[PDB]
UniProtKB/Swiss-Prot annotation, chains A, B:
Record bears the keyword Calcium: no
A biological-process GO annotation: modulation of chemical synaptic transmission
Tissues expressing this chain: Is widely distributed in the CNS. Predominant expression is seen in the neuronal cells of the cerebral cortex, dentate gyrus, and glial cells throughout brain regions.
Residue spans, topological domain Extracellular: 1-515, 565-575, 625-649, 708-717
Species annotation: Rattus norvegicus
Main subcellular location: membrane
Pfam families registered for this protein in UniProt: 7tm_3 (PF00003), ANF_receptor (PF01094), NCD3G (PF07562)
Protein name, entry field: Metabotropic glutamate receptor 3
Alphabetical list of PANTHER family matching this protein: METABOTROPIC GLUTAMATE RECEPTOR (PTHR24060)
Amino acid sequence: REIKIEGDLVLGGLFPINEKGTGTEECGRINEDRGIQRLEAMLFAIDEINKDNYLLPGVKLGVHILDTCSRDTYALEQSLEFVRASLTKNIPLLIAGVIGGSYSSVSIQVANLLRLFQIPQISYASTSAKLSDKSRYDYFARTVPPDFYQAKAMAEILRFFNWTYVSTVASEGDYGETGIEAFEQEARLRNICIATAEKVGRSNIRKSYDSVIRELLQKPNARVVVLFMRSDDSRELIAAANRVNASFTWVASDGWGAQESIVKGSEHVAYGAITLELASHPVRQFDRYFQSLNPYNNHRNPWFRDFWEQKFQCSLQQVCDKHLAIDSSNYEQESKIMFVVNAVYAMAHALHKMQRTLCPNTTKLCDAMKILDGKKLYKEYLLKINFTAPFNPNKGADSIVKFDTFGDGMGRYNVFNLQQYSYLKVGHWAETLSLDVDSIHWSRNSVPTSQCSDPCAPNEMKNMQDVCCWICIPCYEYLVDEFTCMDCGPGQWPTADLSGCYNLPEDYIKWEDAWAIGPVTIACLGFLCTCIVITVFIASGRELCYILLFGVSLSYCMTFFFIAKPSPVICALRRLGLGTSFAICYSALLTKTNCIARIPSSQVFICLGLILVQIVMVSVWLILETPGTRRYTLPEKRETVILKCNVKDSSMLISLTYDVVLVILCTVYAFKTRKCPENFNEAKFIGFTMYTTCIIWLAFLPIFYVTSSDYRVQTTTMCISVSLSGFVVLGCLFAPK
Amino acid sequence: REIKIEGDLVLGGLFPINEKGTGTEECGRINEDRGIQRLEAMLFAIDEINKDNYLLPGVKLGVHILDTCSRDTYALEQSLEFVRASLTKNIPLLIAGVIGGSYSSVSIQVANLLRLFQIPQISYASTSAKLSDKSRYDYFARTVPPDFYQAKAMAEILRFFNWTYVSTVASEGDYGETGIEAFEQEARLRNICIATAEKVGRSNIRKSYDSVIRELLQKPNARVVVLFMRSDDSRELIAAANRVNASFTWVASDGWGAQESIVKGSEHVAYGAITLELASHPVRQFDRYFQSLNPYNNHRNPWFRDFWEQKFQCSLQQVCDKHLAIDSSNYEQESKIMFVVNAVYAMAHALHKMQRTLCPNTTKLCDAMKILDGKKLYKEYLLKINFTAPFNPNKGADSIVKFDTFGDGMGRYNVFNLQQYSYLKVGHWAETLSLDVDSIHWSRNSVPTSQCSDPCAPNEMKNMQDVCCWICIPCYEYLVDEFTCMDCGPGQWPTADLSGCYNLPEDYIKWEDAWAIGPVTIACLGFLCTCIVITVFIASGRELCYILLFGVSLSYCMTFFFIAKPSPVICALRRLGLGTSFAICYSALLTKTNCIARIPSSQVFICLGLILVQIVMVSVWLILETPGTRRYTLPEKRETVILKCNVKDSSMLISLTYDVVLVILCTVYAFKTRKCPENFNEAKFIGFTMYTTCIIWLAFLPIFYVTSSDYRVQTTTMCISVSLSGFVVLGCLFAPK
Ligand SMILES: N[C@](CC1c2ccccc2Oc2ccccc21)(C(=O)O)[C@H]1C[C@@H]1C(=O)O
Ligand SMILES: N[C@](CC1c2ccccc2Oc2ccccc21)(C(=O)O)[C@H]1C[C@@H]1C(=O)O
C-alpha cells in the first residue's frame, strides 16, 4: 500500500517494489534487490536521522513511500499523492522532497511532474544522461553519476601512456545510444578515431554474428572494441564471438560491469576485457539492520510480509518456520545502498542548513518552515551540500557527497579486468586514472597498441591521411608539413634536418686537383727558354721580344687567374686578361711583320704597334662595363649548384674575333715567307709556327666550350698558348748555339 | 468557481477570467476581453456543436472550464482537476482534452502537466515559439501561428523587389528575445545584414533615448528598424524618437499591431511604419449570441454575474437597470474569438473522425470510447484535421484550420501601414506577400532603399567587404572575382568585358608608314645609275661589277624583307640576308683590290673571290641553326606587346665583324692609292668611298640598336648601304660621259 509514518517534515520515496511485465496486472513479482533492499535502506537512514542529535534535533523526519511497479505510467499516478497534500485543495504531510528514482524512465516522468510543483527530487540510482539537462529537469539532483561520465572514462583508459586509439561498438535504446553519442564527442575532442561502429539492437538477431564479422573485417585498426551495451546483449555478442573464436580487448561499460554471468562458457574469448563498475562501498550498519528484520516485527512496511512470502518460496500466513531470518548466507547487499543513504542524508543535511539559517536559535522548526521554499531548498542548500558519506568509516576523499553544478553526483568508477577466470579491480576512475598496469593481464599476454597507421620517422615523414590512417610517403626541406612536399630540398637532395633546401653552398672548385700543376711547369719551361735566349743575345727585334715576353707573362697570370676562387670582379678581370694576352702575342707578330715590309720612324712604328694593342684593351675595358662586373651561379636539376662568374661569355669569343682578324692580318704578312730572309735576318719560321699555334688555340677553345663539365678546359687552352709562345721562339732559335 | 455541465464527452477550458497583479489575493480584477469574451465563445461553440447534427449526432459534448487568473502557479493547481477524474483513484468526467491557453506562461505549464497524463491541449492564443518544440510539449497543438512566423514574414517584406537589407531592434523578455533570434536566423539564411541591434529592456530607462541615438548614429545603412518589441515598450521608444525628432520606417511586429494608442502625439514620427496583425475574421453569429446574454439568464457561467458587476461599474445584486444589455455600441469582439471556435471545432471534428473509425455503424459512442486513446487522438485525427472554419461564410482558402506538422496553426498575418493618421491594411502574409505597393504611403514620400554599399558597376567592380558593406575599388581580366585583382588584364590595360588579359594581340608593325617609301626610291635610283653605266660600257672589271650588282640587288631584298610581317623563318632568313649583302659588297672590293696587287689565273682568282663570300654564307647558315629559326615576342610594363622575330641579335653584329675584318682587310689594299692608277685603270676613288661608306654604315647601326623604338632604324641603315653602293660606282664614273 504505502508507508505514511508521521513526522515533522515528511520525505517522499518511490521504489520499484513490484516488477513490471507480469501480465495484465503488471504490478506483481515483488522485487527484492531493487525494492525492499533499497526501501529498507531509506527507512534505515530515517531511523538513524532521528536517532542522531546533530542533523535535526527537534525535527523528526517522516516518511511517505509509494510503489512505482517499475513502470512510468503507474509512477506518475502514484506520485500525485505527494502533490495532493501541498497546494491546499487527510494526508497533512508537507512533503519537503522525494527520494524516488531507480529506472530512468520512472525517474524522468516524476521529474517532469515534481518540477512543476517545485519539489526537489533525489534519485538514488538513475545514470541516464537526459536527466542532467537542467533546462527540462531543474528540480532533480542525484547522487549517482551519469552515463556520459563513463564515456569520459573509457576515452581516458585509451590515452594513459601511448595507448590505443581506435574502434567502437554500440547498442540500441537509450543506454547504448546516448552513451556512445558521448563517447564519440569525447574521442573526437581528444584525438581518437573510430573503426566500424555498428549497433547490435535486438536481443537475438543475425546482426550480432555479423557484428563480430564486421568488426573482424576491420582487423588492423580494431583490436579494442569499446562496448557500451547492456547485459543481455553483451552475452549475445560474446557468445557470437565465441562461436567464431576471435580475440579482442573488450573495453566495456557499466552494462557489462563485474558480472561473471556475462561471460559463461566463453571466458577465454573475453579474457583481457576492461569494464567499469559504479564503485560503491557496502554499508555495514544497514547490513546488520536489514538482516535483523522480522516478518512479525516489520509492521511499518506492508510489502515485507509479502516479500517474506516471496524470497523464501513459502506462505508466512509450503510453510516456513518462525526462526527463519535474513542473513549474510542468504543474500548480500544491493550494489547501490550507499547511494540511497547518501540521498536521504542529502536532504536532512540540506534541511538542517535551511533550518539553521531561516529559523536560528530554535531546536525545533519555526513557522517559516510551515511553507517550504522549493527553489531555495534546491539551489542554495541541496545543490551546495558538502558533508561526508555516513556509515562508511574509511572517510577517504571519495567519501564526499558533493553535488555537481548540474545536480549530479561525483563520478567514481572501478576499472576491472577479467584474468584467469575472475574479476579483479585494476584501477579507479575518480577524476584521473590510477591503473595498476603491472597487474593487468592482457588478452594476448602483452599490451595491444591498436594504432591504424604507424608514425612516420624523420625519414619518410610525408603523410597522406582518415586522421589516424596516413600513408608514409618516402619524401624536411623546411619541415614543410606532415602532409606535403614541394621538393625544393627534398630527400633526393643533400638536405639537412628541417633546414636543407637548394640554398646549400655546393659550389664546385678545383683547388689544385693535380691537373693545374702542368701549366706551372709549362710556364717555367718557357721562362727558362726565354732567359737562355736573352742571355745568349744580351733594336726592332729587341722591342718585339719585349712585346712577346709580355704576352708570355700575361699567359702565366691567366693560368693563375683561373686557378683562383671565383669572384664578381676577379673572375671578370681574368676573363679580359686572356684577350689582352692573345692580342699582345698577335700584335708583336703584326708589328714584326709590318717592320719587314717597310721599303716611318722605328720609334713611331713601335708606338703605333702599342696603339694596335691598346685598342683591344679599350674594347676589353668597355666590354667589362657591359655586364656590370658580376657573376652568375650555375644551378641544375641535380645537386651541387655552382657559384662562379658569368657563363656563356660570348663577348670572350668576340675578343678572340679581334685577335683572329689580327691573326688573319698577320697571315697576310706571313705569305711573304718566300720574299723574307730565310735562316737569318728575321726568319719566317717563327711566324709560320705562330699561325699554326693560333689555329690550334682556336680549335682547343671550341672543344672546351662544347662540353659542360669544365674540368680543365680553361687550363688546357692556356697551356697551349703558353706552349705555343715558347714554340715560336724555339723554332726560330734552332740554329743559334 | 467552475462550469461543469455534464455531457457524453467533456472538454477542458482554461481562460484568464481573473487578472494577476491585484495584490495579496492576485485573483481579482475579472478580465472581459481576455476571459468571458473567449469563455463564452467556447460555450457558444459547444452550443453549436450539440445543435449541429453532422459533427456528433449521438454525442453531446460537455464542458469543464476552470480559471487561470493569468498566473501559471494558479493554472497548474486548477488544472489538476482534469487529471483527477481520469486515472481512477464525484467528477465522473472523462476529459478528452483541454482548450486552455491564453498567456504563454500559463499554457506552457499546463502543457508540461497534461503531456504526462496523455491529454491533448489546444491553445486558442499562445504565439510563443517555445511551444512549437515537440520534444518538450508533444500533446500541444494550437490554432494560432507562432511568433517566429513573424520573423519569416518581416524578413520577406524586406526582399519583395530589391527592398531594404539592414538594421534590427529587439526587446527583453521572451517575445522580443526569441523572435529576434528567429529574425536573425531568417536574415542570415536569406542574405540580409543587420545594423546596431540593441535591446530596450525595461519600461522607462535611459537606454531607449540612447537607443534612438545609437540607431541614429548608424545612419547610412539603417533606415528600416525592425521592431520586435511589446506595446508598452513601443510607446516608450516612439516617444523617445519623438523628442529627438528623427525619421525612420519602423518595420514592426505583432506587439505594435494595429493599435492607434501606440503612436499618440507622435504620429508624424512613425508615419510610414509597417506592422503585422494576426488576421482574424470576427465571428458574427457569436457577436449576436454574446450580446444576447443576460445576467438573469446566464446561469451556466458563475463569473458572468460578477462580470456584469464589473463592466457596468454597478452592483447587480451604483445600481444598474434591468434592461441593460451587451450591445455593439458598448463593446466589440475580441480579436481572437475566431481562434477559439477553431479550437473547439478542432476537437469535435477530431473526435468525430475517431468515433467513425473506432465505433462505426453507431450514432452514439461505443464502449471503446469509455477509455480514450490519448496518443491516437492527437497524432492521427487532431494532427491531421482539414475542415473549414465555421461561422466565417467567406469560405476562402485561408478559412481552413489545418494543423502544421508541429501542431501549429496556419500562419496568416496582415501587413499594415500608418498613413495620414490611421491604419490601413496594405498586404497579407499567408505564405507569400500580396502587398498593394501603390497604396503604401512611405515615410519620406518615396520608397527607401536602405542598402549599405552601392552595387559596383562593370567598371570599378572590385570590392573589399561586413557582407553588405563593400569598398568599390577602381580595379574584368577574367571576371576574376568581386573581391580581387591580380592585374594581368586590369583596368589599366586595354582589356575587354570579362576576357581581356595580356593575351591580346597588340603586335606593332609599320605597314607602309610613309617612311619606307624612301628606300624604294633609293633602290630605283641605284638601278637607273647601274643601267646607265652598263649601257655606256656594254674582263676582271666586268666580273667585279657583277659581284657589286649582286650586293645592290641583295640590299633591295633586305629593305623589302624588313617591310614584310614578322615570321619565325622569314624574319630569320632576312637577318642573314643583311650579312651576305655586306660581305658581297666588301668581297668585290677585296677581289678588285687583290687583282690590282698581282704583279694565278683570272678565272681561278674569280673562283677564289667567290670562295671568300661563300665562307660568310656558310657561317650565316650555321648561325641560323643556332637559334632554331624562331621568333621571340616583346612584352613590357605598358600595353601593346609586340610579336616579332628574335631581338638583341648579337650574332648579327658577329656577322658584321667578319665584314669589318674584310672591310679592314680592304683598307690594307686601299693604302695603295698612291701606287694605283689615278683617273683611269681601276682608279681608287671608288675604294676610298667604299671605306668611308662602311664606317658610316657601322655608325648608323649602333645608333639604331641604341634606341628601343625601332621605328625606322633598320630601313635607314639599309638606305645608307643602298645609297653607299651607288656612291662608290658614281664617284668612279664621274669622268666618263
Ligand atoms: N542504472 C539504471 C539503468 C541504466 C540505464 C539508464 C538509462 C537507460 C537505460 C539503462 O539501462 C541500463 C543497462 C545497463 C546498465 C545500466 C543501465 C538507470 O536507470 O540509470 C537503473 C537500473 C539501475 C538500478 O536501478 O539499479
Ligand atoms: N499572444 C500572447 C502574448 C504574446 C507573447 C508570447 C510569449 C511571450 C510574451 C508575449 O507577450 C506579447 C507581447 C506583444 C504581443 C504578443 C505577445 C501569447 O501568450 O502568445 C497572448 C497574450 C495574447 C492573448 O492571449 O491574447
